[PDB]
């Protein structure tokens, strides 16, 4: 199974915790507030897709709300090349 | 040079305009609101980082807020492979 980084920004508050509840009942690893990473095979991607889209089954209602989910193939090495930035 | 992934979650409007203003003008790719792409050497990503790591350099002042920047290498059949969720 190929390793994936989840990435997601989400003004709604509902919606990005029951995005972060569904990641986590799927047993990803999160790594920051809008991020998780895990193994999924394609039949464990698909359903990450399927239920992620559902979430997102409505229409936005404001200019500066935004629903957005990136799932991006990585591997083990290039997750360990990262760099994190924070207040310092 | 190696591809990178850059994204960041930065509730300061301030510190994120000029996250992004950086970014734009080290020519990385703009792919979401708060996500862009591009290719960086070794000069070039000491250079992003540094950078980044100069607006990051405050400290928090109230427990919701939130500087986040992971920036990770990709590959380009890597970022083919993505999905991006949406409002739908």
Chains 1, 2 share one sequence.
Not at 25 to 50: C, H, P, T, W
Request: net charge positive; charged share 30%; no cysteine.
């Amino acid at each position: 199974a190929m390793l994936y980084l989840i990435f997601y920004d989400i003004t709604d508050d509902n919606l990005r915790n029951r995005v972060a509840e569904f990641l986590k009942k799927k047993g990803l690893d999160r790594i920051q507030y809008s991020v998780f990473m895990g193994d999924l095979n394609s039949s464990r991607l698909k359903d990450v897709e399927a239920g992620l889209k559902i979430i997102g089954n409505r229409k936005k209602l404001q200019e500066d709300e935004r629903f957005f989910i990136l799932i991006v193939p990585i591997t083990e090495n290039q997750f360990r090349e990262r760099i994190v930035i924070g207040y310092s």
